[PDB]
Amino acid sequence: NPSARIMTFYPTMEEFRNFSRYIAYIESQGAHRAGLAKVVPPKEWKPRASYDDIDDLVIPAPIQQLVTGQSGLFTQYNIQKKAMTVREFRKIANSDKYCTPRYSEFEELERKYWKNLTFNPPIYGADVNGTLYEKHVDEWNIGRLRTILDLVEKESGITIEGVNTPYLYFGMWKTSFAWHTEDMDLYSINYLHFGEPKSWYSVPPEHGKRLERLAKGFFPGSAQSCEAFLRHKMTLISPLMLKKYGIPFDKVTQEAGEFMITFPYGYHAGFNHGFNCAESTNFATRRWIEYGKQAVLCSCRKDKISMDVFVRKFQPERYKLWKAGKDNTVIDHTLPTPEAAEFLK
Ligand code: NI
Ligand SMILES: [Zn+2]
């Protein structure tokens, strides 16, 4: 994937059954180089019958998204509103105030988003612990993907909400997620259960440092405080800004029923088109472990994954060296996960 463009795959049900394996496959095609990729699950596959009964679901801590700034640079302050039901959120989403504007092509709506995101603060029903998958569905069950990440839970007995457990994300028009990499630069999976689309921006992992160097310049105070201020998930930067400053990036629009996959150290951002529900959690492959070792954590806020588990088991030869702190591995982002050798041959 020399261009490092976002890739789209349409697996057969056979190809689909094994998550870890299909991930390895897509990595064998260079999907990881974009930092983000789409998987269109087979026609037959459905994680639930119908989403009719969920109005009673409780959003404990909705966040009003306040966006401060101008000229393609913005800071997003998320304000914890009191709880409300999905019924209540849905009403607000579709209200004439908050309802999505009229458009023909994505292009149109994008401009609109980047012009009006300071006006009319939206609420985002995010960080909702739970899953909309049915118990019997074994295929790509975000609840229980069973990756090597399960070692954290399995060996420590530590449950980390949203990391190894599933989150629900009820979006409305203009609700935004700021440029980020996942916690510990893990992978993540996002399934748009239902509702209007969600557009994604992506910076190649092999250009992530470039984005950091620029973002530091734009928010020098933030960076002077916290080396990894982007982990605050608060920074918005415009596509036209990126063009101005020559940061490579790509766009894709997730439709309802589609999967989006983010790769280690693959910077992503985006916005919801209208009322929708997305389910998410983080996951891992052998390849990640090195990313995990070399990740730049937030120190400035209290409240971090033990890598010792992972280096011991999957890198035993470098265990002592790493503990001695003299492991000077350099990551090559072009390289697919070891597990992909199967499909390279
Ligand atoms: Ni993300
Ligand atoms: Zn911080």
UniProtKB/Swiss-Prot annotation:
The protein's superkingdom reads Eukaryota
The record lists the effect of residue 180 to A as: Abolishes histone demethylase activity without affecting ability to bind H4K20me2
Q: Residue limits of the JmjN domain? A: 6-48
Q: Which residue intervals define the domain JmjC in the entry? A: 134-300
Cell compartments where the protein resides = Nucleus
**Which amino acid positions bind Zn(2+), per UniProt?**
226, 232, 298, 300
Q: In which tissues is it expressed?
A: Ubiquitous.
Q: Which family does this protein fall into?
A: Belongs to the JHDM3 histone demethylase family.
Function in brief: Histone demethylase that specifically demethylates 'Lys-9' and 'Lys-36' residues of histone H3, thereby playing a central role in histone code. Does not demethylate histone H3 'Lys-4', H3 'Lys-27' nor H4 'Lys-20'. Demethylates trimethylated H3 'Lys-9' and H3 'Lys-36' residue, while it has no activity on mono- and dimethylated residues. Demethylation of Lys residue generates formaldehyde and succinate. Participates in transcriptional repression of ASCL2 and E2F-responsive promoters via the recruitment of histone deacetylases and NCOR1, respectively.
Q: What note about domains is in the entry? A: The 2 Tudor domains recognize and bind methylated histone H3 'Lys-4' residue (H3K4me). Double Tudor domain has an interdigitated structure and the unusual fold is required for its ability to bind methylated histone tails. Trimethylated H3 'Lys-4' (H3K4me3) is bound in a cage of 3 aromatic residues, 2 of which are from the Tudor domain 2, while the binding specificity is determined by side-chain interactions involving residues from the Tudor domain 1. The Tudor domains are also able to bind trimethylated histone H3 'Lys-9' (H3K9me3), di- and trimethylated H4 'Lys-20' (H4K20me2 and H4K20me3).
How it assembles, according to the record, is: Interacts with histone deacetylase proteins HDAC1, HDAC2 and HDAC3. Interacts with RB and NCOR1. Interacts with VRK1. Interacts with FBXO22; this interaction promotes KDM4A ubiquitination. (Microbial infection) Interacts with HTLV-1 Tax protein.
Q: What is this protein called?
A: Lysine-specific demethylase 4A
Q: Which organism is it from?
A: Homo sapiens (Human)
